[PDB]
Enzyme design. Structure first.
Site, PDB file in Angstrom:
ATOM      1  CB  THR A 101      40.568  88.940-111.651  1.00 42.72           C
ATOM      2  OG1 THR A 101      41.049  90.268-111.909  1.00 42.72           O
ATOM      3  CG2 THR A 101      41.626  88.163-110.854  1.00 42.72           C
ATOM      4  CD  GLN A 102      40.821  84.955-116.064  1.00 48.69           C
ATOM      5  OE1 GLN A 102      41.782  85.603-115.652  1.00 48.69           O
ATOM      6  NE2 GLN A 102      40.690  84.595-117.337  1.00 48.69           N
ATOM      7  CG  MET A 106      40.845  95.115-114.579  1.00 50.84           C
ATOM      8  SD  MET A 106      42.621  94.989-114.289  1.00 50.84           S
ATOM      9  CE  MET A 106      42.650  94.334-112.625  1.00 50.84           C
ATOM     10  CD  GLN A 138      42.545  90.328-107.649  1.00 52.86           C
ATOM     11  OE1 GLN A 138      41.834  89.567-106.988  1.00 52.86           O
ATOM     12  NE2 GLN A 138      42.101  90.966-108.730  1.00 52.86           N
ATOM     13  CG  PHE A 139      45.044  90.060-113.696  1.00 53.29           C
ATOM     14  CD1 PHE A 139      46.139  89.518-114.355  1.00 53.29           C
ATOM     15  CD2 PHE A 139      44.408  91.162-114.256  1.00 53.29           C
ATOM     16  CE1 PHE A 139      46.592  90.064-115.546  1.00 53.29           C
ATOM     17  CE2 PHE A 139      44.855  91.710-115.448  1.00 53.29           C
ATOM     18  CZ  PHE A 139      45.949  91.160-116.094  1.00 53.29           C
TER      19      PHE A 139
END
Ligand SMILES: *[C@@H](O)[C@H](CC(C)C)NC(=O)[C@H](CC(C)C)NC(=O)[C@H](CC(C)C)NC(=O)OCc1ccccc1
Ligand SMILES: *[C@@H](O)[C@H](CC(C)C)NC(=O)[C@H](CC(C)C)NC(=O)[C@H](CC(C)C)NC(=O)OCc1ccccc1
Ligand SMILES: *[C@@H](O)[C@H](CC(C)C)NC(=O)[C@H](CC(C)C)NC(=O)[C@H](CC(C)C)NC(=O)OCc1ccccc1
Ligand SMILES: [Cl-]
Ligand SMILES: [Cl-]
Ligand SMILES: [Mg+2]
Ligand SMILES: [Mg+2]
Ligand SMILES: [Mg+2]
Ligand SMILES: [Mg+2]
Ligand SMILES: [Mg+2]
Ligand SMILES: [Mg+2]
Ligand SMILES: [Mg+2]
Lengths: 195, 212, 204, 226, 233, 222, 196, 196, 195
Positions: free
Chosen positions: E1-2, E107, F1-2
């Site tokens: 995740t970024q 992710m 957040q993804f």
């Protein structure tokens, strides 16, 4: 969970209410009467947050007693229940609401009929043949769905109530220390001292 | 969901409802919450539909492998413990299961094990599991006797599910009945609540809370 | 937690040829626990009918409130309130509680006594009027009711036909909702007669 | 929701779609989003429906009383000023997003109002979820010195862009034309490009299909004489 | 995740009778800062495919390298690399779509939205979209970001359905694309005036146009606008 | 957040006949309030007279369908070109879904075809693999609008025979393919009116002993 | 937003872009951020459009009432009224305002009022999100007692760069000239200022 | 931090301030942010001091090993090694690096590598917290093919303004000149550049 | 709260453990034996999180039984308690720790002495004359502080234990459905079937 039950039979209303008062880890009392007589033919049981329950019950009691003196007349159970509901419906949108659930059992002397009203802390009123508040109803409602009739006697109502209490004592986790049972009929209110 | 199972004179009664929900949405009224593991073993399903289905059909594969290797049938104790040991490995991961492994063998007799996704494994005579367990307990407990007739016991189990289907919003649809004896299980039919309720009300004279 | 789905329940209304119909289920619960199967959600003030879904305490409170206001209206105006006017009164009354609303989904139904024109309307919890020609829906099975009404409904139905259409819309929508059912009532309304029918439905 | 406002030679036109939604569900397929503040001052609302209706009726009521007090026809800047000061006071909690248009003794006017109390002036504006689809059309086809007929076409085309491309918008096109020295013409359902096709089957039931428990006559009449 | 840092905005495209058109501006934004003004976001693969990319630029440069490496690898032990066994738009897209969905499933996504425009061996037009979630779809018109909201409506007036494609010429389609780019410059706060445009025609091949500008803009009406309501002067 | 999940809308519908089965789905694809495509196929011919649709998050739906088609391919390789029965396909799909129990395929899956006795079959899945054979099932965005209609018009629920008044039910007469397609078209026409994510086009796949046939119908584009 | 006010020999000039945004969507590309609170006292608005409008409307009201009683107010007086509103309501406001006016006695004056509600009298002032990119340019290129034409070029060049780098800034460059001669409005379009 | 690299006729010049902060405390007022990865390939560092040191140390190692095997690396090659480290470890790094070098074939080249790990080849580049204030100044004043003395003045004036406005920038202005002639280090003290 | 008590008297160790198994709102069982025989003269009672309790007890049981077969010898209670403590001390720093508290009652045949060890889920071991886990100790410890002697008989120990259970039944809120009592002495382990 402060077990309070109610059953309306042919000619009377029967209220059963647990005796235990548990504050935290200790049972401080095992003989507590969770009810107030509002008028000679109207009884209200109650359960909810500590302090609020008694404060609310006594407040209602005082108001109905005031009405009785002013008019020299007893309000019908339906009228008392509507008054109580409005107070709770008013309360729910207050700064600090009354966290109290009640059953109102009364005998209407005009119509010669017993009446049982279940009211929660939101002000949700329903007239019922039998009722309960909290987790008690999860066991007792289905049990009464099976064993109830409208033409039952007071003695049959008590036997039916014993069946409910036995089930609660078997399957519920807290020891509620038994119940105080009270009958409301044409002759008024009386307590069953052996149960 | 409401499932029950109880031991009595004539073996075991297993009764389940048929409803499946997703929030307040009724997704199915025709689901099978009893799994026929083998001619003498039954499993009940409560909680996560997929979890229960998947692992109880998996259980049947493990029980079949047992009787191939050991040339003898698996005990209810061993079958229930395979499932409980499995879910214990997954503990904390989020499985949601409430099951009864019911069956009969010679050395055990009629046996019921409650198996749980928390890892709980309990042997006992009576169990009610699911969101409607409390409602079934109320009817079942107050009318239970060890010496019921296969006919009275079947009805009690059926009646206990009906009670819960009525009061519990997340239970309903229909009642599936089973009876387990020395010679295995016996299906006793699908009973739609839409017809059973009115039939029971008329014949039994109960359910006076309702307008009929 | 969500006040509009604690007690559960549904209301639906439909127009027909020189008639209107309004129906409701009878359930009142505390989430999963069914408590009452006699909790009617339709009330009437003169010839104007009002169905209310949502939080039961507010349903009761609003009925008592609109009974209060319509009784005074009648004493002052010397005539019964009409559906169009009552609809505006509901909208006004709800919006005055804009930032502390009643958690309800009201539905008005009736026939104008002067013009004879059938009238239905719906609202959100804070007052917005939905004046539809065909039908109005409200409650925990509103999605289900929308699908049934949209497919089953046709305009200019006769009273006895309209009864069948609305009853089937309610019944089949209620059976796909956990918090709705436990009985049902249908009102068929004509200019000078009103019939009330209790439906037989599955009690689970 | 898609609403637009377009200025032309001798006045202003506003338009709107007719879809009302509660989440992904269509509550009303023929909602009327074109409101009247005064006879020649109309506004279109987006956002919270109850707020846009209530704020419109309130300011419309006060505008009428103001017009009577001053013995003058109401001005758009008055409605604009009253709306923005009301909405600003409530800090955006009244979710009303409006396009206000009209003609008055000063001339023709077109404004937009944001829920927090900001106003903007323009020759062409768009608000709502379909505002981007509509603005793309307005930015492509708008020009100075439009005729009445060209402006109506541009406005309804901008609403159509919202109807087809925005899921929050749909059904029909409402229009109101406010020309100088004329009565304002409200064109309800100016376009109807979304009529439902005939169903394949009739779902009219046989009488008696539904199971009934009890019947009873309801007494709607008052207490009777004799 | 970024989180995406240096970003590219809308990529727009449409089909026409003999091929496909695709366009994108030359800006690399750093939040509200219009940091880099010479970024090429259309990347040709062979003479039959153009990949238009929006979103994170660092991830775009990574993808650019994957495609460059893809061409190299396809030529290995392939005598028909410039003929029958040359890379097709459908091959290039499915590769990227596989990568995008794999990366989201770990992710650790490539924070992009991609449109692969091209013409197949049989002359068929190819236009398909894929993004950081691995979501794919095809349409006569495709656009990313703000273009989805503003360009698609304009391009769908030209090609509203499949049957409108043979009726649409290259001049009409390019006109629609260039107009849409102007509209985005009016309304997208992270757009630039400078852009690149690519045409892939089944007859005339790949035409790549650089250093285009938005022109014929309407601003004159601004002078008449005074205040925010009551201000006459 | 993804957020690794999305919602592409759409709605699907499977109905089983006596000797046939249909699997329908709208052709609209969306994100939030925008339309991605007016024609993006959602129901697929997977071979062996089986049709399939995985509705919800399209990336997960495409992946699942792609994996199942692959499963059919390897079933032929590994078991001497044996035909994959609908019941065997359903069980295989359960394991595909449950294999990602702790990072689910965010879809409502439905397959349709014929059972080994030649009768019409529909199977319905939840996102983590629980499945069940059904006569009727709608899935996706407008499933809550359509299923009650199907309970009423396919299984004749709450319907009784006039004159008896609630005593005798409506008999469960079988439906022809022509009668089923009417219910499908009306179901989607109604769903298109009241659900914003439903529209553009309707594509139906009919399965018989003779094979897999397609029918396409236009839907409102607003 | 990119706004600035510059004092020069004959008076003061206010300058601003015309972009109003909601996230990355340009809600208005032809906004007028140069607003009048008195005949020859104007302000540049930055931050919340609603807050700055409401404030400017209130200030205009106060100065109209001031004028009725005490005659023409000073630019300092107008800045004080802005300050009083911005300071006392600092918790609920997001308004960055530059006040600029012309007296005959005091000539051109510029007061800037940032978020806190502080007041700063300056020879010139810059504000808005786009101002960050031209602190260097403006400091190096500003001179006191410039001519009208020099000051217009200074503002035009400065805001051009602010618009070039800030995504929240753009559209046309509006300018308001305040001198003894009167009030002049100027406008400069993209094709003119982008090529600088 | 204020850093920049500028290509000119004879090659390229790197420039930087000397301030290192911990909040508002200046931990080092004489920092060297211009660091060597090869004889004539240098970098400007911004962001985390630890991250940029660790990266620069690794790059120097890679180019030393490159040189042993394949001879002198290109500036593009050095930028690629920086990129590979910054891109693949983007989640754990806060490093804004400008790479600048001199070949005889390619002459002066400048590559900037912002946070994401993207690479951008430019005629000149600016970075660091102080760069925001000189986007306008640098864009207006940069020309291609400047002389050494002009380029030094351009960097000196630019960083002077960056230091003036940015609290995180300050101290001395360090510069590194990269040409065919060799490597020249320059320094400019506050008293010199503040009065500009 | 899963009541488990222990008392060490002159010549034996007595363990008392509640019979109730409550999952949520329902008492699923009222005859549950919360103990495992580790060896002929060593008994372990347990209480904690569902599933973990039995899994841990049976795991320990298996290990001690394995040791007994391998060496043809019974480990001392002290040795068994140390083994159990180490397993819990190892467990507390694991990915998912055993959430189990135990009492180990044993009779050392070498020293001819009864021994009671209290071990919590952290691996905190103490040898005691009497012990308890959870909330039981809040009532029983002070009560035993008053009525205990080292030279008490087994019968006196049981009477003393009845006193503890009566107090718990009076003052604790849950119905734990009585206790199963087991005695550990020189002759081994036996259950008191009437209590
Ligand atoms: C009653 O216990 C019943 C028994 C099953 C065997 C049917 N369970 C349910 O109804 C259960 C709700 C429980 C947990 C309160 N519902 C489901 O498991 C439900 C079944 C489908 C067929 C509707 N599935 C479900 O909710 O999906 C899980 C999910 C949701 C979203 C994303 C991933 C996974
Ligand atoms: C540039 O600074 C410009 C100056 C105005 C005076 C025109 N401001 C904006 O564009 C501004 C940017 C935001 C981030 C402060 N946008 C708005 O004010 C915007 C205008 C409406 C018409 C869309 N309003 C808005 O976003 O409302 C929410 C809000 C409320 C209070 C404070 C900030 C934002
Ligand atoms: C200016 O950008 C300058 C450039 C360096 C390469 C010299 N950076 C700093 O001064 C820097 C500012 C912070 C906000 C990033 N300060 C530090 O890096 C500081 C230096 C030490 C010696 C005090 N380190 C620090 O604050 O450590 C925590 C940390 C860790 C990782 C990323 C940021 C901050
Ligand atoms: Cl503004
Ligand atoms: Cl350092
Ligand atoms: Mg209640
Ligand atoms: Mg139910
Ligand atoms: Mg229901
Ligand atoms: Mg639609
Ligand atoms: Mg700009
Ligand atoms: Mg820095
Ligand atoms: Mg301890």
């Amino acid at each position: 969970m402060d077990i309070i039950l109610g059953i309306r039979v042919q000619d009377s209303v029967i209220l059963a209410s647990s005796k235990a008062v548990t504050r935290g880890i200790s049972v401080l009392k095992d003989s507590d009467d969770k009810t107030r007589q509002l008028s000679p033919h109207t009884l209200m049981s109650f359960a909810g947050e500590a302090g609020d329950t008694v404060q609310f019950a006594e407040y209602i009691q005082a108001n109905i007693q005031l009405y009785s003196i002013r008019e020299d007349y007893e309000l019908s159970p339906q009228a008392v229940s509507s008054f109580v509901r409005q107070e709770l419906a008013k309360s729910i949108r207050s700064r600090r609401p009354y966290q109290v659930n009640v059953l109102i059992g009364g005998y209407d002397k005009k119509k010669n009929k017993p009446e049982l009203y279940q009211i929660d802390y939101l002000g949700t009123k329903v007239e019922l043949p039998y009722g309960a508040h909290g987790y008690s109803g999860f066991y007792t409602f289905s049990l009464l769905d099976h064993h109830y009739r409208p033409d039952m006697t007071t003695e049959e109502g008590l036997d039916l109530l014993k069946l409910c209490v036995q089930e609660l004592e078997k399957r519920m986790p807290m020891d509620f220390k038994g119940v105080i049972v009270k009958i409301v009929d044409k002759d008024g209110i009386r307590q069953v001292d052996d149960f | 969901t409401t499932t029950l199972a109880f031991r009595f004179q004539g073996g075991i009664i297993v009764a389940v409802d048929s409803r499946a929900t997703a929030g307040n949405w009724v997704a199915s009224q025709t689901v099978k919450k009893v799994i026929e593991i083998n001619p003498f073993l039954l499993g009940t399903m409560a909680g996560g539909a997929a979890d229960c289905q998947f692992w109880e059909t998996w259980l049947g594969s493990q029980c079949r492998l047992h009787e191939l290797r050991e040339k003898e049938r698996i005990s209810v104790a061993a079958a229930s413990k395979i499932l409980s040991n499995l879910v214990y490995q997954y503990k904390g991961a989020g499985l949601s299961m409430g099951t009864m492994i019911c069956g009969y063998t010679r050395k055990e007799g009629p046996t019921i094990y409650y198996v749980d996704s928390d890892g709980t494994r309990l042997k006992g005579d009576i169990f009610c599991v699911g969101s409607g367990q409390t409602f079934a307990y109320g009817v079942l407990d107050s009318n239970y006797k060890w010496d019921l007739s296969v006919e009275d016991a079947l009805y009690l189990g059926k009646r206990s599910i009906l009670a819960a289907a009525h009061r519990n919003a997340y239970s309903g649809g229909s009642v599936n009945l089973y009876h387990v004896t020395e010679d295995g299980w016996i299906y006793h039919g699908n009973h739609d609540v839409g017809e059973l309720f009115w039939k029971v009300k008329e014949e039994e004279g109960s359910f006076n809370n309702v307008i009929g | 937690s969500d006040p509009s789905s604690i007690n559960g329940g549904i209301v639906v209304a439909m127009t027909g040829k020189d008639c209107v119909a309004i129906a409701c289920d009878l359930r009142l619960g505390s989430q999963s626990l069914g408590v009452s199967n006699k909790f009617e959600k339709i009330f009437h003030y003169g010839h104007v009918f009002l169905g209310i879904t949502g939080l039961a305490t507010d349903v009761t409170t609003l009925n008592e409130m609109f009974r209060y206001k319509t009784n005074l209206y009648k004493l002052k105006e010397e005539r019964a309130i009409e559906p169009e006017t009552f609809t505006q009164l509901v909208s006004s009354s709800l919006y005055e509680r804009r930032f502390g609303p009643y958690f309800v989904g009201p539905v008005v139904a009736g026939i104008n006594s002067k013009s004879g024109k059938p009238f239905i309307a719906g609202f959100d919890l804070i007052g917005c009027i939905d004046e539809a020609k065909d039908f109005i829906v409200s409650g925990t099975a509103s999605d289900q009711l929308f699908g049934m009404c949209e497919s089953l409904y046709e305009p200019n139905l006769e009273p006895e036909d309209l009864f069948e259409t609305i009853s089937q819309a309610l019944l089949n929508a209620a059976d796909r909702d956990a918090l709705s059912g436990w009985g049902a009532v249908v009102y068929i309304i004509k200019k000078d007669e009103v019939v009330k029918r209790y439906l037989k439905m599955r009690q689970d | 929701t898609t609403i637009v406002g377009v200025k032309f030679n001798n006045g202003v036109v506003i338009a709107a779609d007719t879809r009302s939604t509660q989440g992904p569900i269509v509550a009303d397929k023929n909602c009327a989003k074109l409101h009247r503040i005064s006879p020649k001052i109309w506004c279109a609302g987006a956002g919270t429906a109850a707020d846009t209706e209530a704020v419109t009726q309130l300011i419309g009521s006060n505008i009428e009383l103001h017009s009577l007090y001053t013995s003058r026809e109401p001005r758009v800047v008055s409605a604009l000023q009253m709306l923005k000061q009301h909405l600003f006071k409530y800090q955006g909690h009244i979710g009303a997003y409006l396009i206000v248009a009209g003609v008055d003794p000063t001339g023709s006017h077109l404004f937009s109002i944001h829920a927090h109390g900001s106003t903007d002036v323009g020759y062409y504006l768009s608000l709502g979820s379909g505002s981007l689809a509509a603005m793309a059309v307005l930015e492509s086809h708008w020009k100075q010195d439009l005729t009445k007929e060209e402006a109506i076409k541009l406005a309804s085309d901008a609403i159509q862009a919202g109807i087809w491309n925005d899921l929050g918008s749909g059904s029909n096109v409402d229009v109101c034309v406010m020309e100088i020295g004329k009565d304002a013409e409200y064109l309800r359902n100016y376009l109807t490009p979304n009529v439902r096709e005939e169903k394949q089957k009739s779902y009219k039931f046989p009488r008696g299909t539904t199971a009934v428990l009890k019947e009873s006559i309801v007494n709607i009449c008052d207490i009777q004489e004799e | 995740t970024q989180q995406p840092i240096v970003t590219g905005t809308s990529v727009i495209s449409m089909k026409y009778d003999n091929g496909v058109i695709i366009a994108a501006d030359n800006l690399g934004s750093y939040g509200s800062l219009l940091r880099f003004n010479g970024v090429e976001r259309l990347i040709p693969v062979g003479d039959n495919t153009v990949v238009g990319i929006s979103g994170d630029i660092s991830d775009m440069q990574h993808i650019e390298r994957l495609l460059k490496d893809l061409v190299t690898e396809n030529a290995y032990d392939n005598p028909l690399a410039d003929a029958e066994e040359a890379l097709e738009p459908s091959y290039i897209f499915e590769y990227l779509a596989t990568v995008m969905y794999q990366r989201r499933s770990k992710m650790n996504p490539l924070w992009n939205a991609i449109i692969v425009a091209g013409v197949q061996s049989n002359g068929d037009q190819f236009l398909r979209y894929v993004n950081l979630l691995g979501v794919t779809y095809s349409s006569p018109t495709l656009a990313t970001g703000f273009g989805a909201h503003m360009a698609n409506p304009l391009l769908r007036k030209v090609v509203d359905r499949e049957s409108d494609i043979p009726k649409t010429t290259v001049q009409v389609a390019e006109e629609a694309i260039v107009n849409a780019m102007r509209v985005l410059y009016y309304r997208d706060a992270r757009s630039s005036r400078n852009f690149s445009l690519a045409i892939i025609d089944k007859n005339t091949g790949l035409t790549f146009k650089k250093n285009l500008q938005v022109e014929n803009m309407k601003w004159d009406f601004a002078k008449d606008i005074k205040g925010y309501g009551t201000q006459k002067i | 957040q993804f957020n690794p999940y999305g919602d592409n809308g759409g709605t699907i519908l499977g109905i089983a006949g006596e000797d046939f089965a249909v699997l329908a789905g709208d052709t609209r694809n969306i994100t939030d309030y925008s339309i991605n495509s007016r024609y993006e196929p959602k129901v697929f011919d997977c071979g062996d007279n089986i049709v399939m649709s995985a509705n919800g998050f399209a990336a997960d739906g495409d992946a699942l369908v792609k994996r199942f088609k692959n499963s059919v391919k390897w079933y032929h390789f590994d078991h001497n070109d044996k035909k994959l029965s609908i019941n065997s396909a359903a069980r295989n799909i359960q394991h595909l879904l449950y294999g990602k129990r702790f990072f689910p395929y965010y879809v409502h899956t439905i397959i349709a075809g014929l059972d080994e006795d030649g009768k019409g079959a529909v199977y319905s899945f939840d996102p983590v693999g629980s499945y069940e054979r059904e006569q009727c099932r709608a899935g996706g965005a407008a499933a809550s609008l359509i299923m009650p209609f199907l309970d009423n018009q396919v299984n004749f629920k709450n319907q009784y025979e006039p004159g008896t008044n609630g005593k005798v039910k409506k008999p469960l007469k079988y439906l022809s393919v022509e009668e089923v397609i009417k219910l499908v078209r009306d179901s989607f026409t109604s769903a298109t009116e009241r659900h914003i994510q439903v529209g553009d086009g309707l594509e139906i796949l009919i399965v018989t002993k003779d094979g897999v046939r397609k029918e396409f119908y236009e839907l409102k584009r607003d | 937003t990119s706004i600035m006010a510059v004092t020069f020999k004959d008076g003061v000039i206010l300058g601003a872009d015309s972009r109003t945004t909601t996230g990355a969507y340009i809600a208005n590309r032809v906004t007028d951020k140069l607003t009048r609170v008195h005949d020859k006292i104007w302000c540049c608005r930055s931050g919340s459009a609603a807050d700055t409008q409401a404030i400017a409307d209130i200030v205009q009201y106060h100065l109209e009432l001031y004028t009725s009683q005490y005659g023409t107010p000073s630019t300092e007086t107008a800045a004080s009224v802005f300050k009083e509103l911005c300071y006392e309501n600092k918790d609920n406001l997001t308004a960055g305002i530059i006040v600029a006016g012309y007296d005959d006695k005091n000539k051109g004056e510029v007061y800037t009022i940032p978020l806190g509600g502080s007041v700063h009298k300056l020879p010139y002032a810059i504000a808005g999100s786009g101002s960050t990119f031209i602190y260097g340019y403006c400091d190096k290129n500003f001179r006191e007692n410039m001519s009208k034409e020099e000051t217009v070029d200074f503002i035009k060049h400065s805001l051009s760069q602010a618009i070039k780098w800030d995504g929240s800034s753009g559209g046309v460059i509006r300018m308001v000239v305040l001198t003894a001669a009167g009030v002049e409005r100027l406008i400069f379009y993209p094709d003119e200022y982008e090529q600088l």
